[PDB]
């Protein structure tokens, strides 16, 4: 209970919100392969390679939950 | 000599020519991309790991001539 209200307490210290569920990852792992042409060189690889990282993690909330991890990430990347 | 000849009867029984070099591979290797998009499916895996096997083979050019090979991968990709 006190846990659930120092979480209500940091919303209200800043007033944003941002859905749950792997929702927030697959936002960024766009921006992320759009932005990754400009820098062009080596650095290319490093930026990409962050990107798959970060998609990396809703498979860990996916596999856990019984489903099969890799067509339930691809329906989501699609959508 | 005899063989140089019978390179020309393979050019003059069948009217087209392409450039060496490389720079086959890396048209197709366009292609490829823009096409398995529309496959979508887990065969879609199977696309794009093919296009990385034919690009993979003006590695084995350029790797073979003293060059850096993935650099000048990279700046043929990009012109």
Do not use: C, F, H
Not at 26 to 41: D, H, S, T
């Amino acid at each position: 209970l006190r846990d659930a209200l120092g979480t209500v307490a940091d919303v209200i210290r800043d007033g944003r919100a941002v859905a749950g569920g792997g929702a927030v990852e697959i936002e960024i792992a766009k921006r992320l392969r759009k932005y990754a042409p400009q820098v062009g060189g080596k650095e290319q690889l490093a930026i990409e390679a962050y990107a798959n990282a970060i998609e990396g993690l809703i498979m860990i909330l996916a596999e856990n939950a019984g489903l099969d991890p890799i067509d339930k990430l691809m329906q989501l990347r699609s959508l």
